[PDB]
Design a protein around this nucleic acid. Structure first.
Ligand SMILES: [Mg+2]
Ligand SMILES: [Mg+2]
Ligand SMILES: [Mg+2]
Ligand SMILES: [Mg+2]
Ligand SMILES: [Mg+2]
Ligand SMILES: [Mg+2]
Ligand SMILES: [Mg+2]
Ligand SMILES: [Mg+2]
Ligand SMILES: [Mg+2]
Ligand SMILES: [Mg+2]
Ligand SMILES: [Mg+2]
Ligand SMILES: [Mg+2]
Ligand SMILES: [Mg+2]
Ligand SMILES: [Mg+2]
Ligand SMILES: [Mg+2]
Ligand SMILES: [Mg+2]
Ligand SMILES: [Mg+2]
Ligand SMILES: [Mg+2]
Ligand SMILES: [Mg+2]
Ligand SMILES: [Mg+2]
Ligand SMILES: [Mg+2]
Ligand SMILES: [Mg+2]
Ligand SMILES: [Mg+2]
Ligand SMILES: [Mg+2]
Ligand SMILES: [Mg+2]
Ligand SMILES: [Mg+2]
Ligand SMILES: [Mg+2]
Ligand SMILES: [Mg+2]
Ligand SMILES: [Mg+2]
Ligand SMILES: [Mg+2]
Ligand SMILES: [Mg+2]
Ligand SMILES: [Mg+2]
Ligand SMILES: [Mg+2]
Ligand SMILES: [Mg+2]
Ligand SMILES: [Mg+2]
Ligand SMILES: [Mg+2]
Ligand SMILES: [Mg+2]
Ligand SMILES: [Mg+2]
Ligand SMILES: [Mg+2]
Ligand SMILES: [Mg+2]
Ligand SMILES: [Mg+2]
Ligand SMILES: [Mg+2]
Ligand SMILES: [Mg+2]
Ligand SMILES: [Mg+2]
Ligand SMILES: [Mg+2]
Ligand SMILES: [Mg+2]
Ligand SMILES: [Mg+2]
Ligand SMILES: [Mg+2]
Ligand SMILES: [Mg+2]
Ligand SMILES: [Mg+2]
Ligand SMILES: [Mg+2]
Ligand SMILES: [Mg+2]
Ligand SMILES: [Mg+2]
Ligand SMILES: [Mg+2]
Ligand SMILES: [Mg+2]
Ligand SMILES: [Mg+2]
Ligand SMILES: [Mg+2]
Ligand SMILES: [Mg+2]
Ligand SMILES: [Mg+2]
Ligand SMILES: [Mg+2]
Ligand SMILES: [Mg+2]
Ligand SMILES: [Mg+2]
Ligand SMILES: [Mg+2]
Ligand SMILES: [Mg+2]
Ligand SMILES: [Mg+2]
Ligand SMILES: [Mg+2]
Ligand SMILES: [Mg+2]
Ligand SMILES: [Mg+2]
Ligand SMILES: [Mg+2]
Ligand SMILES: [Mg+2]
Ligand SMILES: [Mg+2]
Ligand SMILES: [Mg+2]
Ligand SMILES: [Mg+2]
Ligand SMILES: [Mg+2]
Ligand SMILES: [Mg+2]
Ligand SMILES: [Mg+2]
Ligand SMILES: [Mg+2]
Ligand SMILES: [Mg+2]
Ligand SMILES: [Mg+2]
Ligand SMILES: [Mg+2]
Ligand SMILES: [Mg+2]
Ligand SMILES: [Mg+2]
Ligand SMILES: [Mg+2]
Ligand SMILES: [Mg+2]
Ligand SMILES: [Mg+2]
Ligand SMILES: [Mg+2]
Ligand SMILES: [Mg+2]
Ligand SMILES: [Mg+2]
Ligand SMILES: [Mg+2]
Ligand SMILES: [Mg+2]
Ligand SMILES: [Mg+2]
Ligand SMILES: [Mg+2]
Ligand SMILES: [Mg+2]
Ligand SMILES: [Mg+2]
Ligand SMILES: [Mg+2]
Ligand SMILES: [Mg+2]
Ligand SMILES: [Mg+2]
Ligand SMILES: [Mg+2]
Ligand SMILES: [Mg+2]
Ligand SMILES: [Mg+2]
Ligand SMILES: [Mg+2]
Ligand SMILES: [Mg+2]
Ligand SMILES: [Mg+2]
Ligand SMILES: [Mg+2]
Ligand SMILES: [Mg+2]
Ligand SMILES: [Mg+2]
Ligand SMILES: [Mg+2]
Ligand SMILES: [Mg+2]
Ligand SMILES: [Mg+2]
Ligand SMILES: [Mg+2]
Ligand SMILES: [Mg+2]
Ligand SMILES: [Mg+2]
Ligand SMILES: [Mg+2]
Ligand SMILES: [Mg+2]
Ligand SMILES: [Mg+2]
Ligand SMILES: [Mg+2]
Ligand SMILES: [Mg+2]
Ligand SMILES: [Mg+2]
Ligand SMILES: [Mg+2]
Ligand SMILES: [Mg+2]
Ligand SMILES: [Mg+2]
Ligand SMILES: [Mg+2]
Ligand SMILES: [Mg+2]
Ligand SMILES: [Mg+2]
Ligand SMILES: [Mg+2]
Lengths: 72, 212, 119, 185
RNA sequence: AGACAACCUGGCGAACUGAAACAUCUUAGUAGCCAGAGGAAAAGAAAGCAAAAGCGAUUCCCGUAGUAGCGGCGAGCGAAAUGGGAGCAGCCUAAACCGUGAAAACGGGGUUGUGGGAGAGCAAUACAAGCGUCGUGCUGCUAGGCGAAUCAGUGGAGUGCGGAACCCUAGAUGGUGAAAGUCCAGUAGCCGAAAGCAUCACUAGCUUAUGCUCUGACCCGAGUAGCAUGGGGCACGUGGAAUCCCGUGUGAAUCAGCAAGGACCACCUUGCAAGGCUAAAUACUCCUGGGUGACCGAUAGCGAAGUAGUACCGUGAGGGAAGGGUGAAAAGAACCCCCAUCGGGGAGUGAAAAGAACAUGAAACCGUAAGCUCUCAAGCAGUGGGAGGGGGACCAGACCCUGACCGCGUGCCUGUUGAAGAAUGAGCCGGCGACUCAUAGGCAGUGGCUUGGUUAAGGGAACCCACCGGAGCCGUAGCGA
RNA sequence: GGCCAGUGAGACGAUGGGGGAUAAGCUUCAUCGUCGAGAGGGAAACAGCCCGGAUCACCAGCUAAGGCCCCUAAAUGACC
RNA sequence: CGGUAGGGGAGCGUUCCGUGUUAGGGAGAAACGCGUGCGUGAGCCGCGUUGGACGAAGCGGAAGCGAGAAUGUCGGCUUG
């Protein structure tokens, strides 16, 4: 019994990995105040976007067991 | 094989020739492979027995300035610390285990490379086990010198058998190691000046480690 | 495996101290001071190996000036040098200063050549 | 060229010597050690949490939880060991040979772990098989059994474990079949 | 009855801390205290898991897995079943009924679960298995004994060296004027116990025991389970909250039953709560006996190599030091001189005086002698130039010491937009004194295999290590809640 | 793109401006230079101005900025 | 081919282990003191009218592994 790293659970309910190994997330802002958001916007806020390279560090550091290709 | 091996009878006349053919490390990496294999061995052999007291093991602190001067360990107005004499040891050794791991196949490779280097030395023998009944060291040494083993230079007898008489007859020479395949180390092979096999033994080694 | 520092310290220190022989006072005693003093020594040394090259040229030029001014009423270092060059001679300033002290008649000759040709 | 304890040594590049920080400046990271001046990163001890930005609401917090996970809908899990025909081509199958599950552990093309141990097999069309093989699996993709029956291979589909149904719902599901049957006949 | 280091069980039970504040949560049921018992304790013989296929008391390790989940869905917490090992062991009793009493008790009978037992009849009987006074047995422990083989030379001493020999079932170890297989004690090997202890066998004896058929009426652990409330604990924070265990109040059913299968109901599977007891595998070191050490060597290692928990300090709880090495052997210096003693100088001892404040003996610091030099001088004390003077040379044109006078030259560190700073820090010298270790994740460099790779615990001629050990794990399919 | 740092107090100078009194070695922005992290020369001395960016040796030489009575290197030069 | 924060490359040394019960060593080891010796440096190599018994090089391994700063700390000794 050593200590194995713990997956940060609050990040793993947020981010995931696609088959080719890139990280994705949801987009923020569809839960309420929808009426006043135009339908074009509402559609944009429904899709899955690849996480911004900048954040990859923090993300990766908190999800040690996620299989991730950074494309090397 | 690229070389023969002499087979000598109990008197020392050459009766035959043998071939011991093994998996060798590719010429480049041999020295590394063996090296590693050796290091590993010596490092697993090690027992971390070195122990200190950390700052909190050390006897009889209390947290306070000292009321009176301890000659050699402190002065009057001072705070307790590691920096006194008699203080804890910062980052001293704790009991460890040094045990590392190496791949099985890598291991075996080291063994083979070693023994396949040692073919410039090695003899073979006609399986002398019977000629010893009462354990006699004097006799064993006689036999050695007949085979051309100087009872100085550290030689290795790799046999299948431990026949009690032979086992005991060799016990007290410091330069022999009598090895079953049960005890066979990279270390001793590397360490030995002269290598000595029996027929059964060559048959064994050339099978376990055989090149295909 | 405990390791006392042992002599590795005092060798270093001792080898430093050897440097600082003949420093007045506590620059020759205390190790801690001696250290600094060593650095500064080495430093000035480096500096003045560079000052040196400036200084002797200073000197030589000065001596040359004096050596020439003896001859004509109007004659200088500057005038001289200019003439050495428009006559195509290579003698540098060390040599003219040394020939000025050690062989003064020679410098008189040189001047007489320069004049004859400038005439 | 013989090996002894003395001719040994490592490979260039293998063991690279470690930084020992805080010895001398000429060496390496001396003084500060490469932490620069002060502040929290240069202080001893546990840092700040890896996902933490300064107190601005962290990325992971300001983004909504992933679809199914977010509520406690059970995550999706593979229920079959997928095999394509590629793998079956590559392997040493002679005609008449039985594929099944077992014979793919034998030739090692599938090494199943605990979860996969307990699983069934499924066959997915990819690559064009040439041979007549006798296949036993619990399921096929449509494309799969199309290409397989095209090539002349016999597809043996294995029975799944029975679902236990109480009697009443048997009476219902059978009443159905009785209806269909009385209607067509 | 008291004592008892750690481990263990029960009872009470925090706070700093983390959450970059904090209150739920974390720290942690940790520390501490109290009580208790043992060489281990606890747990433990399915009212259990599981899922339509199966397992077969408990504990411990590997793995599943940082997975499912829990969570101001924050900080964090975190399973289990299948699978691999270590180790194995199952038993007593209540009630129905039959005896004895007025009882309360005692004696027989009876103990199980894809149901048993009591009830009523008919068969089998001898082996098997478990426990154990007594006692020569076996072995081991608590004293021991026998035990091979060398000499001369070399400057205090020979084990070293050169030169000869020898033993080895013994070349572990310690000592010896100096390092030893052959000098001593020993070691291998081999013998040895009147007495006590211990594990084992045997040991009279004590125990038990089967077989079938009929009978739903007799029993199968009651203030119990459940229910309503208040909580506690389960990975699980009241949540849809099961299972488990407790305060208050109510309160069942007996096998045609009852409980469990994560609210609840139906069906099926599994099990038999409300009586007890049990070895091993696992934890630990105040210790005992062996062994090893890429452990310390007097500022280290235990606080403690000497009065060490001492001296000393504190009313008290408590705090808590220092001082090691003359030589092989005291041979520790007879006698004379200085001489009140101490101390010294000779003589004598000794390889050496190493002369008792005695072994190597650095630095600061204190001096003594010899060479050059300072009393019109302003300076982080040096440096480049070098007057005059001195010294040891062999490449005598060089080196070394001194230093007339000229030039240049704003201590070190830290930290700052920036310092000589009148900014901080250091009396000086010598020691001690800081990016360490374990375990995981990522990346790089090196190898090994790529007939994909690798084993974990575990086993190992004690370790190491040969050889095992494929359970797992990584890579072979994705998309989708 | 990978791996993996420091920095996130700036200072003055030139120029454009705002605040202030077209006050401040003040303050706050914009485009640049030096210091920071840069020694050498010129500036009596003199972080931020001018010249110039120091691998090292030389008792060699030519120059930049700046200079040529003496301290102190070069003209007590020439002509208005 | 200036350089702070800082990053990368190449090395030296200390104690210990393997080789090793090594080479060498009362014909004087470690240490201590010295050098017209050799290194870019850390240092190395040589020498002793000291010292009195241990212990290199090479090729490898491991750390209680390098001090001038902590109003560090313990001893020793100054200044006043
Ligand atoms: Mg994938
Ligand atoms: Mg919605
Ligand atoms: Mg980053
Ligand atoms: Mg304490
Ligand atoms: Mg201590
Ligand atoms: Mg030591
Ligand atoms: Mg140290
Ligand atoms: Mg001098
Ligand atoms: Mg390291
Ligand atoms: Mg480096
Ligand atoms: Mg420093
Ligand atoms: Mg860093
Ligand atoms: Mg600092
Ligand atoms: Mg910082
Ligand atoms: Mg902190
Ligand atoms: Mg902490
Ligand atoms: Mg954390
Ligand atoms: Mg939501
Ligand atoms: Mg999915
Ligand atoms: Mg897999
Ligand atoms: Mg008691
Ligand atoms: Mg008591
Ligand atoms: Mg007890
Ligand atoms: Mg709190
Ligand atoms: Mg609080
Ligand atoms: Mg807090
Ligand atoms: Mg905080
Ligand atoms: Mg036990
Ligand atoms: Mg018990
Ligand atoms: Mg049982
Ligand atoms: Mg039972
Ligand atoms: Mg199991
Ligand atoms: Mg087993
Ligand atoms: Mg069992
Ligand atoms: Mg009864
Ligand atoms: Mg009975
Ligand atoms: Mg049933
Ligand atoms: Mg039944
Ligand atoms: Mg009956
Ligand atoms: Mg004897
Ligand atoms: Mg003897
Ligand atoms: Mg002799
Ligand atoms: Mg001899
Ligand atoms: Mg001995
Ligand atoms: Mg014995
Ligand atoms: Mg019944
Ligand atoms: Mg309730
Ligand atoms: Mg609860
Ligand atoms: Mg609950
Ligand atoms: Mg239950
Ligand atoms: Mg359950
Ligand atoms: Mg309770
Ligand atoms: Mg109740
Ligand atoms: Mg009832
Ligand atoms: Mg219930
Ligand atoms: Mg059950
Ligand atoms: Mg019951
Ligand atoms: Mg219950
Ligand atoms: Mg019970
Ligand atoms: Mg019990
Ligand atoms: Mg002492
Ligand atoms: Mg001590
Ligand atoms: Mg000492
Ligand atoms: Mg006397
Ligand atoms: Mg008197
Ligand atoms: Mg006297
Ligand atoms: Mg005498
Ligand atoms: Mg004598
Ligand atoms: Mg002494
Ligand atoms: Mg005057
Ligand atoms: Mg004078
Ligand atoms: Mg003066
Ligand atoms: Mg001067
Ligand atoms: Mg001056
Ligand atoms: Mg300030
Ligand atoms: Mg000052
Ligand atoms: Mg300052
Ligand atoms: Mg300041
Ligand atoms: Mg200090
Ligand atoms: Mg001060
Ligand atoms: Mg002070
Ligand atoms: Mg250190
Ligand atoms: Mg760190
Ligand atoms: Mg580590
Ligand atoms: Mg790693
Ligand atoms: Mg590779
Ligand atoms: Mg193992
Ligand atoms: Mg074991
Ligand atoms: Mg083991
Ligand atoms: Mg900011
Ligand atoms: Mg600011
Ligand atoms: Mg700052
Ligand atoms: Mg400005
Ligand atoms: Mg401006
Ligand atoms: Mg304008
Ligand atoms: Mg105006
Ligand atoms: Mg303005
Ligand atoms: Mg300003
Ligand atoms: Mg300009
Ligand atoms: Mg700065
Ligand atoms: Mg610059
Ligand atoms: Mg400048
Ligand atoms: Mg200047
Ligand atoms: Mg410029
Ligand atoms: Mg240039
Ligand atoms: Mg340059
Ligand atoms: Mg010129
Ligand atoms: Mg002049
Ligand atoms: Mg004029
Ligand atoms: Mg550079
Ligand atoms: Mg740097
Ligand atoms: Mg060395
Ligand atoms: Mg050394
Ligand atoms: Mg050493
Ligand atoms: Mg020797
Ligand atoms: Mg010597
Ligand atoms: Mg030594
Ligand atoms: Mg040396
Ligand atoms: Mg060397
Ligand atoms: Mg001696
Ligand atoms: Mg060596
Ligand atoms: Mg340390
Ligand atoms: Mg100091
Ligand atoms: Mg002091
Ligand atoms: Mg005094």
């Amino acid at each position: 019994k050593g200590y194995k790293m713990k997956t940060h659970k609050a990040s793993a309910k947020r981010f995931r990995v696609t088959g080719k190994g890139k990280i994705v997330r949801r987009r923020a802002g569809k839960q309420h105040l929808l009426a006043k958001k135009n339908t074009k916007r509402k559609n944009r806020l429904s899709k899955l976007i690849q996480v911004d390279r900048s954040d990859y560090d923090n993300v990766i550091g908190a999800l040690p067991y996620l299989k991730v290709n950074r494309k090397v | 094989e690229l070389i023969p091996l002499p087979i000598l009878n109990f008197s020392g006349e050459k009766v035959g020739e043998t071939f011991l053919n093994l998996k060798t490390a590719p010429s480049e990496t041999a020295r590394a492979v063996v090296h590693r294999g050796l290091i590993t061995h010596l490092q697993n052999k090690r027992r971390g027995t070195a122990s200190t007291l950390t700052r909190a093991e050390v006897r009889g602190g209390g947290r306070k300035p000292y009321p009176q001067k301890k000659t050699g360990r402190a002065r009057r107005g001072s705070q307790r610390s590691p920096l006194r004499p008699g203080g804890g040891v910062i980052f001293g050794p704790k009991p460890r285990d040094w045990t590392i791991k190496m791949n099985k196949k890598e291991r075996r490779l080291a063994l083979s490379t070693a023994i396949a280097s040692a073919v410039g030395n090695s003899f073979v023998v006609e399986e002398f086990a019977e000629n010893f009944e009462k354990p006699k060291t004097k006799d064993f040494i006689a036999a050695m010198q007949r085979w051309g083993l100087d009872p100085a230079e550290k030689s290795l007898f790799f046999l299948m058998d431990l026949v009690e008489n032979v086992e005991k007859s060799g016990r007290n020479i410091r330069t022999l190691k009598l090895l079953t395949p049960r005890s066979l180390n990279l270390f001793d092979v590397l360490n030995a000046e002269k290598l000595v096999f029996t027929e059964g033994t060559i048959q064994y080694l050339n099978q376990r480690y055989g090149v295909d | 495996t405990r390791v006392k520092r042992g002599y590795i310290a005092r060798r270093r220190r001792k080898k430093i101290r050897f440097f600082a022989s003949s420093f007045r006072g506590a620059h020759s005693r205390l190790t801690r001071t001696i250290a600094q003093q060593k650095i500064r020594a080495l430093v000035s040394a480096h500096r003045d190996r560079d000052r040196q090259k400036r200084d002797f040229r200073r000197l030589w030029i000065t001596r040359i000036n004096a050596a020439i001014r003896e001859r004509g009423v109007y004659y200088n270092y500057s005038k001289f040098i200019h003439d050495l060059y428009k006559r195509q001679l290579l003698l540098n300033r060390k040599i003219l200063a040394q020939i000025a002290i050690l062989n003064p008649n020679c410098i008189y000759m040189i001047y007489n050549e320069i004049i004859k040709k400038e005439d | 060229t013989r090996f002894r304890l003395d001719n040994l040594g490592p490979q260039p590049g293998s063991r690279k010597k470690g930084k020992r920080k805080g010895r001398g400046h000429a060496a390496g990271q001396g003084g500060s050690c490469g932490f620069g001046m002060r502040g929290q990163k240069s202080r001893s001890g546990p840092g700040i949490m890896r996902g933490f930005e300064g107190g601005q609401m962290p990325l992971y917090r300001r983004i909504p939880k992933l679809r199914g996970i977010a509520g406690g809908m059970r995550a999706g899990l593979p229920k079959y060991v997928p095999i394509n025909l590629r793998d079956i081509e590559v392997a040493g199958f002679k005609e008449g040979e039985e594929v099944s599950l077992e014979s793919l552990k034998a030739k090692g093309i599938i090494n199943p772990s605990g979860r996969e141990r307990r699983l069934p097999l499924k066959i997915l069309g990819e690559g064009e098989l040439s041979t007549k093989l006798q296949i036993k699996a619990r399921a096929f993709s449509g494309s799969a059994k199309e290409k397989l029956e095209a090539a002349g291979c016999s597809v043996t589909v294995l029975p799944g474990r029975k679902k236990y149904i109480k009697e009443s719902v048997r009476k219902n599901l059978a009443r159905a079949d009785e209806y269909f049957a009385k209607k067509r006949a």
